[PDB]
Scaffold this active site. Sequence first.
Site, PDB file in Angstrom:
ATOM      1  N   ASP A 128     -11.407   2.114   9.751  1.00 49.05           N
ATOM      2  CA  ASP A 128     -11.189   1.546   8.419  1.00 49.05           C
ATOM      3  C   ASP A 128     -11.833   0.165   8.353  1.00 49.05           C
ATOM      4  OD1 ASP A 128     -10.280   1.644   5.747  1.00 49.05           O
ATOM      5  OD2 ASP A 128      -8.261   0.959   6.254  1.00 49.05           O
TER       6      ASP A 128
ATOM      7  N   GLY B 171       0.825  -1.187   0.000  1.00 45.69           N
ATOM      8  CA  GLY B 171       0.000   0.000   0.000  1.00 45.69           C
ATOM      9  C   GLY B 171       0.864   1.243   0.000  1.00 45.69           C
TER      10      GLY B 171
ATOM     11  N   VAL C 152       3.435  -5.825   3.100  1.00 45.46           N
ATOM     12  CA  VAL C 152       3.117  -6.933   4.046  1.00 45.46           C
ATOM     13  C   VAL C 152       3.642  -8.255   3.473  1.00 45.46           C
ATOM     14  CG1 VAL C 152       0.752  -7.349   3.231  1.00 45.46           C
ATOM     15  CG2 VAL C 152       1.363  -7.895   5.586  1.00 45.46           C
TER      16      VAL C 152
HETATM   17  C1  LIG Z   1      -2.557 -13.392   5.939  1.00 42.06           C
HETATM   18  O1  LIG Z   1      -2.775 -13.205   7.359  1.00 42.06           O
HETATM   19  C2  LIG Z   1      -2.653 -11.859   7.809  1.00 42.06           C
HETATM   20  C3  LIG Z   1      -2.728 -10.769   6.880  1.00 42.06           C
HETATM   21  C4  LIG Z   1      -2.623  -9.465   7.365  1.00 42.06           C
HETATM   22  C5  LIG Z   1      -2.424  -9.234   8.726  1.00 42.06           C
HETATM   23  C6  LIG Z   1      -2.300  -7.857   9.298  1.00 42.06           C
HETATM   24  C7  LIG Z   1      -2.266  -6.711   8.662  1.00 42.06           C
HETATM   25  S1  LIG Z   1      -2.050  -6.270   7.074  1.00 42.06           S
HETATM   26  C8  LIG Z   1      -2.131  -4.571   7.139  1.00 42.06           C
HETATM   27  N1  LIG Z   1      -2.035  -3.669   6.294  1.00 42.06           N
HETATM   28  C9  LIG Z   1      -1.815  -3.888   4.843  1.00 42.06           C
HETATM   29  C10 LIG Z   1      -2.742  -4.507   4.097  1.00 42.06           C
HETATM   30  C11 LIG Z   1      -2.501  -4.688   2.708  1.00 42.06           C
HETATM   31  C12 LIG Z   1      -1.307  -4.227   2.148  1.00 42.06           C
HETATM   32  C13 LIG Z   1      -0.370  -3.590   2.927  1.00 42.06           C
HETATM   33  O2  LIG Z   1       0.836  -3.120   2.381  1.00 42.06           O
HETATM   34  C14 LIG Z   1      -0.612  -3.401   4.275  1.00 42.06           C
HETATM   35  N2  LIG Z   1      -2.355  -4.116   8.573  1.00 42.06           N
HETATM   36  C15 LIG Z   1      -2.444  -5.430   9.552  1.00 42.06           C
HETATM   37  O3  LIG Z   1      -2.636  -5.399  10.746  1.00 42.06           O
HETATM   38  C16 LIG Z   1      -2.348 -10.323   9.665  1.00 42.06           C
HETATM   39  C17 LIG Z   1      -2.460 -11.616   9.174  1.00 42.06           C
HETATM   40  O4  LIG Z   1      -2.378 -12.734  10.077  1.00 42.06           O
END
Ligand SMILES: COc1ccc(/C=C2\S/C(=N\c3cccc(O)c3)NC2=O)cc1O
EC number: 2.7.11.1
Length: 328
Positions: free
Chosen positions: A154, A46, A51
Amino acid sequence: GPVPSRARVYTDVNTHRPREYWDYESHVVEWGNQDDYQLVRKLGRGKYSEVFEAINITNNEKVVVKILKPVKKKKIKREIKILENLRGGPNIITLADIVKDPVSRTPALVFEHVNNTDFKQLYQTLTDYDIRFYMYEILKALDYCHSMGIMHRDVKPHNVMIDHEHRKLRLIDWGLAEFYHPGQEYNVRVASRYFKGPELLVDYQMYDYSLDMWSLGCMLASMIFRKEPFFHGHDNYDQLVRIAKVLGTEDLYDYIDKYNIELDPRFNDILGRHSRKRWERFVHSENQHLVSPEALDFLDKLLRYDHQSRLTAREAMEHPYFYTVVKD
Ligand SMILES: COc1ccc(/C=C2\S/C(=N\c3cccc(O)c3)NC2=O)cc1O
């Protein structure tokens, strides 16, 4: 000027918490060991982070690592403090660690891993019972964070991770979350367009936890009516017009008149006049198995213009729509 507003519940939570609880600018981060984690594959990107799936090599457990792009340290500390305050709460993603990434020169947040299905595919599959169950699980997370003085800001399908095999749900992405303080004016550039509450779309800054309840109502509408997203605006102005074509313009004017708010004059040529609609018009043969009188009443009580009139998360959990959900 605009009439002030207060949350009708959990109004004074941060008032009577110790200052350390909500004063995230003074928070001192406890850094872990960056070499404990090996990145496996990139899961997303993003404007503010990337991530990754990773492995914690001290226990060979999968984790998820969010490596921040440069952003104000105030906001990094805000997200960290909120995640630590909420850790262990029902259906809140668990922050396991915080490390300094040597390449990005930024913090990397380490989360528990959820074996998720993409909502676009999961939503084509959930039954009426599944939807009620998972809505109840989201409400548990929202009542918890609201009761802890925090608004998520969000709520959207992409931020609800579901491992359908184990009926496990986690609310993720606390990067926009804030502490609620009575009388504070907040940034209205939060939430994704389709989930923005009317208060954001009319530039009313003294909002509260009830924003999350509008966003949840948008999610519910998309699921029971099989239209994703439900209010599908092409920009933030058209977003309000899409809402007004369903909730009607007279109650929009009642809302802004109650708070002595003025609409952007650019709505003069696009808003029109619209009656309030009955929710039954959105029912058809391909979604009626997901619709009940209870679902329509519950939805109707979430999607109110007036943020002070929406169900609270706790009130929502009392609604007859959830009577068929098995309680543990
Ligand atoms: C596949 O399992 C998981 C997947 C995500 C999370 C936690 C996230 S992801 C995020 N932000 C984003 C989302 C999309 C793109 C990017 O660059 C940042 N904020 C969070 O807390 C935890 C998991 O166990």
